[PDB]
């Protein structure tokens, strides 16, 4: 069985800005998404072991981030496309089942020895194959929902099934950024793959939650830790800076400044104290014990 390359062999830092790129991309690593995918992977491996009576090997691939059109362009056709909803997040998610994985599951469920792989002829899946895909998708959605519980409880609901990417309509524009997580499934000598693709706008509100690699916290231990940390930080020193007033001028007048020159300024009724440029309070100025003193009036809330 010749691969495409074998068949071909035998037969033979400055970039322009395109506003059609939606550059709101996350250059930070989504560790939390990686942990969720690992948990999802394990929970599903179990489910597949229970369903198929065989031990599956599921490998999580790299979480590649790319525009939607590129993701669509790299999807083998025909393929089983399933639309899912991740409540309460807004949007439609995709669970992509490759025909090879579907055929392997059908073989295992119906007593297939696995010695005769079924070649994809490009035909539509039958009703029995549709029911098998249904069961696999239900198991996958249950595993995904259970995996997401530790970070953010989400309800996964199946919407409809499609065979062509054009009917998915999960993104407003072909250039929209989506998050795709490929999975490789090995069953005996047969290898299958499936993909989970999520639009970035769906997970954009949870960007900070997805960023850091988090877990193992508490409610009372963390409470005491936070209280003691707050107590410790209160001893830190800050530089309190009070500005007398502000004068709008030009650079030419600065060059003409000489000893004795008087610059008119508006008399401030209150003096604003700034910490690293951030105002914290308003006060009146005075002299106490031979030093300039500020009489606090209000604290900036």
């Amino acid at each position: 069985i010749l691969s495409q390359a074998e068949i071909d062999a035998l037969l033979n830092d400055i970039r322009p800005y395109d506003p059609n790129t939606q550059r709101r991309v996350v250059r930070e690593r989504l560790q939390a998404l990686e942990i969720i995918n690992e948990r999802f992977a394990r929970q599903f491996r179990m489910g597949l072991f229970n369903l198929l009576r065989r031990s599956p090997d599921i490998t999580v691939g790299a979480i590649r981030i790319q525009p939607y059109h590129e993701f669509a362009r790299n999807l083998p056709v025909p393929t089983n496309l399933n639309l899912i909803h991740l409540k309460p997040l807004r949007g439609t998610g995709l669970v992509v089942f490759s025909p090879s994985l579907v055929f392997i599951a059908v073989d295992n469920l119906f007593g297939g020895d696995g010695r005769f792989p079924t070649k994809v002829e490009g035909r539509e899946f039958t009703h029995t194959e549709q029911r098998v895909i249904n069961r696999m998708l239900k198991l996958a959605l249950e595993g995904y929902s259970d995996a997401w519980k530790a970070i953010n409880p989400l309800e996964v609901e199946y919407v409809r099934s499609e065979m062509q990417v054009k009917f998915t309509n999960i993104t407003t524009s072909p250039n929209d950024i989506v998050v795709n997580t490929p999975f490789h499934v090995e069953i005996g000598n047969l290898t299958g793959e499936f993909n989970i693709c999520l639009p970035f706008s769906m997970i954009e509100p949870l960007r900070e939650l997805l960023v850091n690699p988090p877990l193992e916290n508490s409610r009372h231990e963390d409470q005491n830790w936070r209280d003691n940390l707050v107590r410790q930080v209160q001893h830190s020193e800050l530089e309190l800076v009070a500005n007398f007033a502000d004068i709008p001028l030009r650079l030419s007048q600065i060059l003409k400044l000489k000893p004795g020159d008087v610059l008119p300024i508006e008399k401030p009724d209150r003096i604003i104290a700034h910490v690293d440029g951030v105002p914290v309070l308003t006060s009146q100025y005075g002299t106490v014990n031979g030093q300039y003193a500020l009489r606090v009036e209000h604290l900036i809330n």
Binding site: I1, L2, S3, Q4, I7, L10, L11, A72, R73, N74, L75, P76, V77, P78, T79, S98, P99, S100, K119, V120, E121, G122, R123, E124, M163, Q164, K166
Partner: protein, 129 residues
Amino acid sequence: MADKELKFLVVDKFSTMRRIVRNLLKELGFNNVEEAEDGVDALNKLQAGGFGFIISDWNMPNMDGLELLKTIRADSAMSALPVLMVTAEAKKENIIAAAQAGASGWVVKPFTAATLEEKLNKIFEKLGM
């Protein structure tokens, strides 16, 4: 660039596969696409003329892809017509037989749109289109 008005003949025993191929060609800028259910219908439509490219499946009822390619090559008016072969199993013997018959390209199911676009570009470059 290849002529966007080039006429394509998609031959496959499955209507869904033909629709998928037509949509992929439309996404590539080719809108003149006709469909054939088997080799006999493909040859009958070829006798009408006007086609510039053929995408045919290997195993089809009443005529397989190899016999259709041989018939096309045996016809002087269509001997130079490029034919793209799409199959489910890439057996070496079948590929060698198709190459000896004069196949312009080979695609293995399942495939992506990128692979089809690359094959079409290579075929057009070989033909100088």
